[PDB]
């Protein structure tokens, strides 16, 4: 039994039968799926919860691990694999793989390349390994164990909040509460019980459409709050902070950070150096945005547009403030300090201007 795919994107629905099959996806991005076929009654009796043992690098999918070593799907030029509703052991190749575990407690390792791992429902152990890998998480209270490996990796919690009924609770008003500095993510919360993922070596977090708390670690992080009024703290390192829609609060902390308030009325604070080399970029975007500045913050630059009622809050008395034009920029210095807040192109036109300052 042989199957050769075309030059386009092909999808092969593979059963858990006992025969040996040859699969060649050919050109294009091709997927084998093992979650559409209903596992037979004899296999459920003799295999139990054990699913498939798949190795794209070895080019074999074992459909009856241990019990029937003949029952092997030999694959080549297949980039993506979807597991069974049972406990699977899935390993990609050095190419970009999409590896879905679906139901059951699956162990998935992507090997090299930029892989997309989705454990699905169940107690999943996910290794991104080399490359820039993405972990797609799902609406569930069961814990997952994520290791990004080397490279710039991303855990994505968009699917926590979806249309229809949501299984996992979110009774504190938050979608997820992610702390890369402590290596866990609170994916769900109820009165008197919390549900955590173990996340290690992952640099980036994508939030939900509800309020999220995203806290980075010492590395360069990219945190995207998405919808809802989010709270984002980058920690040390040069971070990239995205508020998205809603009224967000973005804190770059130490390092040279870049803050994108996005739509809505956002509060942007570049932070202060932990120890001169502290330059933060604050782009509040559209809406009425508030920029925080103080002693020890260094040299931060605001980029504004739309010419609204954006405000600046400086932790210093009004008589400590010193305004100077620099080219086309307005430069607000705190007397006695080397700290300076620059509004980019303030003198070019009204759209770039910020004209309200709250002082201490």
């Amino acid at each position: 039994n042989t199957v050769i795919g075309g030059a386009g994107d092909d999808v092969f629905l593979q059963d858990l039968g006992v025969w040996s099959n040859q699969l060649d996806g050919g050109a294009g991005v091709d997927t084998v799926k093992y979650n559409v076929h209903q596992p037979s009654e004899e296999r459920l009796e003799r295999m139990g919860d054990t699913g498939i043992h798949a190795d794209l690098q070895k080019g074999t999918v074992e459909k009856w691990p241990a019990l029937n070593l003949f029952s092997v799907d030999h694959v080549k030029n297949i980039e993506n694999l979807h597991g069974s509703r049972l406990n699977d052991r899935i390993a990609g190749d050095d190419q970009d793989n999409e590896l879905w575990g679906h139901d059951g407690n699956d162990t998935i390792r992507g090997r090299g390349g930029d892989d997309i791992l989705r454990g699905g429902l169940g107690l999943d152990t996910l290794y991104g390994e080399d490359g820039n890998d993405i972990f797609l998480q799902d609406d569930e209270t069961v814990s997952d164990d994520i290791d990004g490996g080397a490279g710039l990796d991303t855990v994505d919690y968009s699917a926590m909040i979806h249309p229809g009924r949501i299984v996992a609770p979110h009774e504190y008003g938050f979608g997820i509460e992610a702390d890369l500095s402590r290596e866990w993510v609170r994916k769900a919360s109820a009165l008197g019980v919390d549900y955590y993922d173990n996340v290690r070596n992952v640099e980036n977090v994508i939030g939900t459409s509800m309020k999220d708390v995203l806290i980075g670690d010492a590395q360069a992080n990219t945190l995207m709050g998405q919808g809802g009024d989010d709270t984002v703290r980058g920690g040390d390192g040069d971070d990239l902070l995205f508020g998205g829609d809603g009224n967000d609060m973005l804190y770059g902390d130490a390092g040279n950070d870049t803050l994108y308030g996005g739509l809505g009325d956002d509060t942007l604070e570049g932070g202060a150096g932990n120890d001169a080399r502290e330059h933060d970029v604050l782009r509040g975007g559209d809406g009425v945005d508030t920029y925080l500045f103080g002693v020890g913050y260094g040299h931060d630059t605001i980029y504004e547009s739309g010419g609204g009622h954006d405000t600046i809050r400086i932790n210093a008395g009004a008589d400590q403030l010193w305004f100077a034009r620099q080219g086309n920029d307005l430069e607000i210095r705190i007397l006695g300090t080397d700290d300076a807040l620059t509004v980019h192109d303030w003198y070019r036109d009204a759209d770039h201007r910020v004209e309200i300052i709250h002082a201490a």
Partner: antibody
Amino acid sequence: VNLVESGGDLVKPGGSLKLSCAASGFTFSSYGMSWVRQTPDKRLEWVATISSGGTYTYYPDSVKGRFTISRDNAKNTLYLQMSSLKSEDTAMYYCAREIMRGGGYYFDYWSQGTTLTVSS
Amino acid sequence: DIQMIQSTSSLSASLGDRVTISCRASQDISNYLNWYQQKPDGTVKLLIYYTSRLHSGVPSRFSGSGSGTDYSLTISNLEQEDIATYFCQQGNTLPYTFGGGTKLEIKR
């Protein structure tokens, strides 16, 4: 939820000591854990926090370079190795579980205190 | 670092009285303010986190309030078991500093 501290003793100035904390009643590997000490003047001071996976350790300036917090998730144990001890380190040492909520940290469960005496 | 100052080091109040313990931070700690109770035998218990959120098993006569730099712990009906020292703590930034503590004793 239970945390059982141990290891306190008397050490001469400049010596070393390792404290242990046995955890039970929760998934130890999902939580950051911490050590907090109380000096004879009853003041409390955070001295170490470790990430759930052990990758990151955090210390105040007063113990940096001298204290090492570590954990054995397989054995549900938290450790605090101390070196170059001074009289100012004489304190009651607690081990606590760290929690983050809404962007801020707190310690929701504490062990009892163990006594470190630094004296010749 | 952020300094936590409790102006009162010790106070005595009667049974059934309303007791308030104040805490002050040298900076804005963004409501990340926690209260701990240390009984005379040394055991430490969390009472309140995030300014006003009550920990599990904490009696409802405990309450917290404040914002910015000023925060308060309030015991609405002082009970005999409430003899203890009460510490505030900011969980905003490293290092996570504690207030000096307020020893509470019963005014017989």
